[PDB]
Amino acid sequence: LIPIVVERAYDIYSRLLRERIVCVMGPIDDSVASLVIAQLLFLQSESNKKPIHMYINSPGGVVTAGLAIYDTMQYILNPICTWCVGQAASMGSLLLAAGTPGMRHSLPNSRIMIHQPSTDIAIQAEEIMKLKKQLYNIYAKHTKQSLQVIESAMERDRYMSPMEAQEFGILDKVLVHP
Amino acid sequence: LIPIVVEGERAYDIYSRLLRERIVCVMGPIDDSVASLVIAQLLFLQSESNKKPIHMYINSPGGVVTAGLAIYDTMQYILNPICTWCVGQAASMGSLLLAAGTPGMRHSLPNSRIMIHQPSTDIAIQAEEIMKLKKQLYNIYAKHTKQSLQVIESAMERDRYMSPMEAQEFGILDKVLVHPP
Amino acid sequence: LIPIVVAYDIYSRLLRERIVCVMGPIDDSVASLVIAQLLFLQSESNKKPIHMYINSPGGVVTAGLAIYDTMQYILNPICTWCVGQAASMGSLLLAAGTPGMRHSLPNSRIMIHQPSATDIAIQAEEIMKLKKQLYNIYAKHTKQSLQVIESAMERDRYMSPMEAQEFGILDKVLVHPP
Amino acid sequence: LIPIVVEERAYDIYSRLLRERIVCVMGPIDDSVASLVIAQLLFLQSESNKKPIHMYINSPGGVVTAGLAIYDTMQYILNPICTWCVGQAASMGSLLLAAGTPGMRHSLPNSRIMIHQPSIAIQAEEIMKLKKQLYNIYAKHTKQSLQVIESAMERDRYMSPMEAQEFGILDKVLVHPP
Amino acid sequence: LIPIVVERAYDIYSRLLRERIVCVMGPIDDSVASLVIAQLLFLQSESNKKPIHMYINSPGGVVTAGLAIYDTMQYILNPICTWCVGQAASMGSLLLAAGTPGMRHSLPNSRIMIHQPSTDIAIQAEEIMKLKKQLYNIYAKHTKQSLQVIESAMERDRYMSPMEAQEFGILDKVLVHPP
Amino acid sequence: LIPIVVERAYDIYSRLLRERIVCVMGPIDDSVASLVIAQLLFLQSESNKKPIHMYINSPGGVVTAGLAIYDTMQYILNPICTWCVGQAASMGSLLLAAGTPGMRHSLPNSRIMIHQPSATDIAIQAEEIMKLKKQLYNIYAKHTKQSLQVIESAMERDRYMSPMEAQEFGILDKVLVHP
Amino acid sequence: LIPIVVERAYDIYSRLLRERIVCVMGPIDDSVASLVIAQLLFLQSESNKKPIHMYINSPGGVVTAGLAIYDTMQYILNPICTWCVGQAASMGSLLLAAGTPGMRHSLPNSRIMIHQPSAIQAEEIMKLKKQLYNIYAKHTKQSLQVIESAMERDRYMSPMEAQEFGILDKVLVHPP
Amino acid sequence: LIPIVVERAYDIYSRLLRERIVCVMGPIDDSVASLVIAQLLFLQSESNKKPIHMYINSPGGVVTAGLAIYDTMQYILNPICTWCVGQAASMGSLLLAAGTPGMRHSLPNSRIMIHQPSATDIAIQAEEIMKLKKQLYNIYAKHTKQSLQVIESAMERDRYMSPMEAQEFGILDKVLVHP
Amino acid sequence: LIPIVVERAYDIYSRLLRERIVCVMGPIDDSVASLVIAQLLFLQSESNKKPIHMYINSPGGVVTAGLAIYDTMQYILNPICTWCVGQAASMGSLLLAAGTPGMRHSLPNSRIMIHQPSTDIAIQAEEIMKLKKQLYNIYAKHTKQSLQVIESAMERDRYMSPMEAQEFGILDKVLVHPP
Numbered sequence A: 001l002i003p004i005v006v007e008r009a010y011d012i013y014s015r016l017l018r019e020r021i022v023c024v025m026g027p028i029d030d031s032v033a034s035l036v037i038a039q040l041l042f043l044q045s046e047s048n049k050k051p052i053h054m055y056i057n058s059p060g061g062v063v064t065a066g067l068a069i070y071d072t073m074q075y076i077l078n079p080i081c082t083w084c085v086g087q088a089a090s091m092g093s094l095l096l097a098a099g100t101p102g103m104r105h106s107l108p109n110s111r112i113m114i115h116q117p118s119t120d121i122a123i124q125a126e127e128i129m130k131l132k133k134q135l136y137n138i139y140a141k142h143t144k145q146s147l148q149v150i151e152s153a154m155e156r157d158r159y160m161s162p163m164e165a166q167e168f169g170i171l172d173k174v175l176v177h178p
Numbered sequence B: 001l002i003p004i005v006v007e008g009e010r011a012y013d014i015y016s017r018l019l020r021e022r023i024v025c026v027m028g029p030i031d032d033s034v035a036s037l038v039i040a041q042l043l044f045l046q047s048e049s050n051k052k053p054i055h056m057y058i059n060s061p062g063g064v065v066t067a068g069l070a071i072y073d074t075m076q077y078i079l080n081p082i083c084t085w086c087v088g089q090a091a092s093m094g095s096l097l098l099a100a101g102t103p104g105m106r107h108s109l110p111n112s113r114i115m116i117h118q119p120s121t122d123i124a125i126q127a128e129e130i131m132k133l134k135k136q137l138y139n140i141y142a143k144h145t146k147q148s149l150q151v152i153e154s155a156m157e158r159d160r161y162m163s164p165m166e167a168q169e170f171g172i173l174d175k176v177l178v179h180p181p
Numbered sequence C: 001l002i003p004i005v006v007a008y009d010i011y012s013r014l015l016r017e018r019i020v021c022v023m024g025p026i027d028d029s030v031a032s033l034v035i036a037q038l039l040f041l042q043s044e045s046n047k048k049p050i051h052m053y054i055n056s057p058g059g060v061v062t063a064g065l066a067i068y069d070t071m072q073y074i075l076n077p078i079c080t081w082c083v084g085q086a087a088s089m090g091s092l093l094l095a096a097g098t099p100g101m102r103h104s105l106p107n108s109r110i111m112i113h114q115p116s117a118t119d120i121a122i123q124a125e126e127i128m129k130l131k132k133q134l135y136n137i138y139a140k141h142t143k144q145s146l147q148v149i150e151s152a153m154e155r156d157r158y159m160s161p162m163e164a165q166e167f168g169i170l171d172k173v174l175v176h177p178p
Numbered sequence D: 001l002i003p004i005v006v007e008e009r010a011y012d013i014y015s016r017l018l019r020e021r022i023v024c025v026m027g028p029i030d031d032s033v034a035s036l037v038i039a040q041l042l043f044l045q046s047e048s049n050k051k052p053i054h055m056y057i058n059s060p061g062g063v064v065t066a067g068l069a070i071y072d073t074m075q076y077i078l079n080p081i082c083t084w085c086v087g088q089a090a091s092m093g094s095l096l097l098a099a100g101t102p103g104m105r106h107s108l109p110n111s112r113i114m115i116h117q118p119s120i121a122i123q124a125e126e127i128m129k130l131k132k133q134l135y136n137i138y139a140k141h142t143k144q145s146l147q148v149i150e151s152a153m154e155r156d157r158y159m160s161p162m163e164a165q166e167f168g169i170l171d172k173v174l175v176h177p178p
Numbered sequence E, I: 001l002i003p004i005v006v007e008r009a010y011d012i013y014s015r016l017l018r019e020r021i022v023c024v025m026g027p028i029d030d031s032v033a034s035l036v037i038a039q040l041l042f043l044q045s046e047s048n049k050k051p052i053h054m055y056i057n058s059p060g061g062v063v064t065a066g067l068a069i070y071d072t073m074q075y076i077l078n079p080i081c082t083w084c085v086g087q088a089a090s091m092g093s094l095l096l097a098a099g100t101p102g103m104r105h106s107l108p109n110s111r112i113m114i115h116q117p118s119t120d121i122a123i124q125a126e127e128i129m130k131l132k133k134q135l136y137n138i139y140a141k142h143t144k145q146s147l148q149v150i151e152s153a154m155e156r157d158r159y160m161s162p163m164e165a166q167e168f169g170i171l172d173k174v175l176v177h178p179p
Numbered sequence F, H: 001l002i003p004i005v006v007e008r009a010y011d012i013y014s015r016l017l018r019e020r021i022v023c024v025m026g027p028i029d030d031s032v033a034s035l036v037i038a039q040l041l042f043l044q045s046e047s048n049k050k051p052i053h054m055y056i057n058s059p060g061g062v063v064t065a066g067l068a069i070y071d072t073m074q075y076i077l078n079p080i081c082t083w084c085v086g087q088a089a090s091m092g093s094l095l096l097a098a099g100t101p102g103m104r105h106s107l108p109n110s111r112i113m114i115h116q117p118s119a120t121d122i123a124i125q126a127e128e129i130m131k132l133k134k135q136l137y138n139i140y141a142k143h144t145k146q147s148l149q150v151i152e153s154a155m156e157r158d159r160y161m162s163p164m165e166a167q168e169f170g171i172l173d174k175v176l177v178h179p
Numbered sequence G: 001l002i003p004i005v006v007e008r009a010y011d012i013y014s015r016l017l018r019e020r021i022v023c024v025m026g027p028i029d030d031s032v033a034s035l036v037i038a039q040l041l042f043l044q045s046e047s048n049k050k051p052i053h054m055y056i057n058s059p060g061g062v063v064t065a066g067l068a069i070y071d072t073m074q075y076i077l078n079p080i081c082t083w084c085v086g087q088a089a090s091m092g093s094l095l096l097a098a099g100t101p102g103m104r105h106s107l108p109n110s111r112i113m114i115h116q117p118s119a120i121q122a123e124e125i126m127k128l129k130k131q132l133y134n135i136y137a138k139h140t141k142q143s144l145q146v147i148e149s150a151m152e153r154d155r156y157m158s159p160m161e162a163q164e165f166g167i168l169d170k171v172l173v174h175p176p
């Protein structure tokens, strides 16, 4: 299914990694996180300082899996450029807003949602709400919107255009080309 | 069961071989995974030459809409000119990726069937958020075909396929070819 | 299993009290049975009040709008009652009972937000048409404006009966018979 | 669990509907539904060939041949036939609607009404043969030209009552009788 | 769910049988045959000479199953009126054509097919042909058409209008209201 | 839906039993055998002289279960008339073949096979499949009067007999169009 | 599977309703709540002052369903004797402890749990859990904080414990 | 398991591609169309004069997908030789019928049908099924030289042609036993 | 899991092909045919005149699929030795009998069936007979038996010993060790 590019040969995904590109496409579960995180770990390995690019077209995922990616971004020292294409919904839009500031881009026609929809083992009512609070905090930190504003907004079941998402605090740039 | 071809000497699979020739295939229904794979091919073919044209082959009935836009956006983005080709069919997102190639490089072979009507995706979605997305498609189709909104709107209301000649005359493609020009 | 009272089954017996039961989700068949029950009671009496027990989590919008239209149609007074919850189409029925006769028991949940009608596949321009009808019905029956209804229906949340009372969905909140 | 009403004599509420001359057409039209309606239509005629029959329609359509039998049986019998659309009348379901007796086709306010067809294995010529029957059937009862019909039925959309009235599917859009 | 209608009170399919109406709706199988034949052997007993009506709407079914329903229709003394609503394809149409001459009917918007599609066991290739040739001879007989004409026309994968059905030999009248 | 006929209330399958008609529509498993044997004994209790009628239209069934019915037939005293409509295949045609002599009928278009098809109540050894097969030979040869080597080579051929071919072989006695 | 008893011919469940015994066997989904509420309003119509006996052997259920059985209980004029056999887990022990004071019972070897077992939002899901905290408080006469910490243990208490904690009043083995 | 042949290592399906043999075993869906079109272009890149060989043995497939291949065939410059073994049914026989003239072969025992069977990439309206059917007429009439009314009544009949009957109709040119 | 054996090193099915052994194990379908034919068209190319060996153990398969494998065996110039181990029923036996005269073999404990059981589409009744008659003519040809003898004997649902197979015309030798 997946083609080979050539100089001296890799496959095209291995090839995107040689360009320091971690894809996060589709739903976020523990494996995807385990996979993204090894790549982030590998790239900082290669340079403490060279930026990393994180292409994000996801529709959500397991919160605890999403959070180990947030945490790892925060852990590594590289500048981290995050790219949303197609959509970044729920956990993905958190990952998207967690990029290095002034490096969170969205392509022109994407859709962005922070509304949580609806986790591994089932959990108690208080343990979900403790989790939701962690998301509030992460979103307030990265958008500079107040706690109250993050909450009142995650209550609406809607999407933002990249420009709304830019002016809320999730994106900095919105493109068309370089 | 994918064949191998040889060409010192080197051996590719035949799909990897089509990518040397700068051809990205969009055959089949479009989802996030396809779009991931198409984008990768598109950004590589640019990094090997951002002026050398990329050819995209579109034989598709549709797909996730957001995943469809993700391609159209990577389309508009890259410096390369893009030659679109429609064999078989191009419906919904297929006709959008078809009509979203470089002006005057948009092709159908003769017996193809084109539809811009959308079928009645991804996770479940509020009413307004749908009409949001619909209106985007209304603007993209307008942009490239050079038709008006009310025209594109009334056109996508009809549940029908059009002929490469008819699609041309509408603004979806530019040439309809039988043999190598 | 359903039981027998004295010579009647218990649900058929509830019908003798002019109690029509909208339990569970609302599909074309539940609509057919309800409307059949509402027409019947009216032929019994034009003016004798009819009681509609609503504990529904929502349903098919076109199935619902029909039960709504019948309620409008029959000359009877209708007392709606909400127990357990009245979500999506169900709250729309609750709100549509006769003014001053929309009740709710104390621990219910009421949600007018719509979920993520379902009969055949349908176009964006049609799904919006529907929502706009819900906006009218709801705004018509809550003395709120389209502006107020469209916003509230955007929040993905439930209302307490006293909150649902102060908005316009229901009139009373009983604990015992008044 | 279909309820029981007593008049004196024990009747299930759908039995009771049919002792009011009300044939229901809930839900999708298939062969068994067709057989079942055709039986009630013939019954009620034997009963009386002058007393009108009320045909209740909340159908997203169904099998084309089966719809045609219910159509022809209507046309066959002598009774005035009132049609009532409540909820939705789509595809074949709205042929049965507009196939009612002139002056006697009704719909309630919040219905939807679609004549676009959806999409016993059939060839290509036979699909067009059937559609060409529908065209004709719709063209007769609306009084629209075959041309005005064919255009309409390729638009993928629903009508309000008042459209479907401006067009020849209904005659009346009621909200309450006298 | 089957309604009741009303002395005495019957479910609407039972009351139809009271009017001497046997129904053949949908795919014909061994059960639909044993139940038809029960209904046919019963109406003969209540009157050897009173007409029965078979309401056919059916896309065919098992070949042997429909022959049983045929063989009984030919055994019993009753005149048999056949009515076609909806469709009558495959074996269904054989039963349509197998009514008493001049009492085979269709309603106006019906579709009729004698083509067979592509049977209770699995059987060799010789036996399928036997079955087919059994149908040629039956269709030949009631249409009064030749073997070759029946044979050429069951080749064509199409449906007849109630009119060309009438012209062919499959039915005798197409009605729009009572006469 | 099974309709109701009136005189008392009577579902049509019971109404047939009041006529002394035992049905063998469908395949043969232990339950059909049980439900048939019970009607055979019931009617004989009723009267050990009045004929019983077995309507057979069967693709076959469990060999032992269909043996159980043959053994009940031979045990009851009644004249038994067997009628084949549709088809009587394997165990079905054995039952057909075991009416009492001169009373075994088919209809014209019916089909009849005594080939055993390649089921079982519990998997069994090879000798035990022959022990059964040989019983079905010996049973068949008795009621056809044909020899074993004429029954054996017969059941080898994986084909269907016309009823007239079944009349000549000894499987039946009358092949009738009308009563 | 459901036998008949003669009187004058009821199935034995219809017979238990004639004795004013409403059964809440099973998990609690909306149809059970629809059914229970139907019986409670009926027994009230017959004599709004005769007691009703609610039998309870349930592992839990759809929270809002149980809250409709709850709400109905509190609504009707009639005393309600709640009787736990087998177990009253989650919403079950809610209904159990929501009987008329003094009339909340358990046969000896019952198991009682007020821990909730582990689709909507998180703020909603808490809004519900806080409803349960109050209701359990209201009837056990334990304090909010104590109910919260209580319900936090995944445990099952004995009919004696359940009594001490305020969930039931009488642990009995034979009649009086 | 697909074996490996030696000269370099070569799986046998690639070894056929080195001979310029594109296979169309199996039914036709978008992926077969994609995987065939890629081999057609590959070989033409190789040489726009050398003949290509299409081995067809297909029960049919998605009409649009099989159109995509016909359009690729007509676009490439190469002499295309089509060989039918086993069968070429519906869309398969269209491809068969569209080799370049005088180079369309069958083997002796092969079977050939241009009946369209009663699939699809997304459910479609009725007019759109005719828009396709009429394309398949016009395509067929071109490569057989037969008229439309001779193609139309042809494809009605739900049968198979012998290869010699296919040679005479215009679907092929050679019917050969050995090379 | 397939073993490797050993210069160069092959998987054991690849190494068998090196010995010019094509295998036909199990049910024959369009793929097994396109893969056999690849293996057959390849061994002809490496030598038009060197013998190929087809190892047949198979209970038959699709009828058209096996004809394709036949049609190629008749096309290629190669002498073809056929070996039967296990069983060779239905189309398998046709391929067994379709080897070069005097090079058709079986091992001693094999079972052989020419009876066909009870095919890539669904097809009418006329086409199944066409297929069957195509098999009569093929079996007639290689056994040198008459049409009627082939016809009578495919009626019998049985299996031949490798000896009576040899006597009939299906094979030429039964071996116990190398000669």
Ligand SMILES: N#Cc1cccc(CN2CCc3ncn(Cc4ccc(Cl)cc4)c(=O)c3C2)c1
Binding pocket: A037, A038, A041, A042, A045, A072, A075
């Ligand atoms: N879950 C997890 C996880 C996530 C973030 C950070 C860490 C910390 N750990 C501690 C151990 C460690 N040891 C070596 N390296 C260098 C390296 C990494 C990957 C590659 Cl491929 C090559 C070299 C580390 O980065 C870390 C980070 C854990």
Ligand SMILES: N#Cc1cccc(CN2CCc3ncn(Cc4ccc(Cl)cc4)c(=O)c3C2)c1
Binding pocket: A012, A015, A016, A019, A053, A055, A056, A083, A084, A085, A107, B039, B040, B043, B044, B047, B073, B074, B077
């Ligand atoms: N979804 C997505 C997406 C779509 C369009 C543009 C971008 C932006 N990205 C950011 C980082 C980046 N880094 C390297 N290149 C060159 C290159 C890429 C892949 C290969 Cl194999 C070889 C070279 C880029 O083009 C970009 C553009 C994101």
Ligand SMILES: N#Cc1cccc(CN2CCc3ncn(Cc4ccc(Cl)cc4)c(=O)c3C2)c1
Binding pocket: C035, C036, C039, C040, C043, C070, C073, D013, D016, D017, D020, D022, D054, D056, D057, D084, D085, D086
């Ligand atoms: N979908 C539908 C639908 C919904 C509401 C109203 C109507 C209009 N219809 C038309 C015919 C009719 N005929 C008799 N009655 C009296 C009656 C009905 C049922 C019973 Cl059991 C007893 C008495 C009517 O109320 C109506 C109203 C249609």
Ligand SMILES: N#Cc1cccc(CN2CCc3ncn(Cc4ccc(Cl)cc4)c(=O)c3C2)c1
Binding pocket: D038, D039, D042, D043, D046, D072, D073, D076, E015, E016, E019, E021, E053, E055, E056, E083, E084, E085
């Ligand atoms: N498919 C079908 C079908 C559709 C329309 C008309 C007919 C004609 N049939 C034939 C025989 C017949 N016999 C009696 N009646 C009166 C009656 C009917 C049902 C009941 Cl319960 C009671 C009385 C008839 O109307 C007809 C008309 C067939």
Ligand SMILES: N#Cc1cccc(CN2CCc3ncn(Cc4ccc(Cl)cc4)c(=O)c3C2)c1
Binding pocket: E037, E038, E041, E042, E045, E072, E075, E076, F015, F016, F019, F021, F053, F055, F056, F083, F084, F085
């Ligand atoms: N398969 C079958 C089958 C079809 C047609 C005729 C027969 C022959 N049989 C034999 C025995 C018999 N016994 C009584 N009757 C009268 C009767 C039947 C049923 C009822 Cl409810 C009422 C009266 C018969 O007509 C026959 C005809 C078999």
Ligand SMILES: N#Cc1cccc(CN2CCc3ncn(Cc4ccc(Cl)cc4)c(=O)c3C2)c1
Binding pocket: F037, F038, F041, F042, F045, F071, F072, F075
């Ligand atoms: N398998 C079985 C089986 C087959 C043949 C014979 C028997 C013997 N048995 C013994 C017990 C018995 N007792 C009463 N009767 C008369 C009767 C039967 C059924 C009904 Cl409904 C009414 C009356 C008997 O005929 C027998 C026959 C068993």
Ligand SMILES: N#Cc1cccc(CN2CCc3ncn(Cc4ccc(Cl)cc4)c(=O)c3C2)c1
Binding pocket: C010, C013, C014, C017, C019, C051, C053, C054, C081, C082, C083, G037, G038, G041, G042, G045, G072, G075
């Ligand atoms: N969810 C629900 C629900 C819960 C509590 C109260 C109510 C209010 N309603 C109003 C209508 C009504 N009408 C008659 N009765 C007496 C009665 C009830 C059932 C039977 Cl079988 C027999 C008599 C009532 O108790 C009520 C209570 C709704």
Ligand SMILES: N#Cc1cccc(CN2CCc3ncn(Cc4ccc(Cl)cc4)c(=O)c3C2)c1
Binding pocket: B017, B018, B021, B023, B055, B057, B085, B087, B109, H037, H038, H041, H042, H045, H071, H072, H075
């Ligand atoms: N569906 C499809 C399709 C069908 C017919 C024509 C085309 C046009 N395209 C345009 C791009 C292109 N670019 C290079 N080549 C040479 C080549 C092709 C494949 C390989 Cl492996 C090696 C070399 C082309 O032939 C084409 C044809 C598309």
Ligand SMILES: N#Cc1cccc(CN2CCc3ncn(Cc4ccc(Cl)cc4)c(=O)c3C2)c1
Binding pocket: H015, H016, H019, H021, H053, H055, H056, H083, H084, H085, I037, I038, I041, I042, I045, I072, I075, I076
């Ligand atoms: N179904 C099929 C089929 C079966 C037998 C013969 C043919 C006809 N074809 C046409 C083209 C062709 N081209 C090359 N060769 C030589 C060769 C083939 C494969 C390999 Cl691996 C090596 C050499 C041919 O034999 C043929 C015969 C079709």
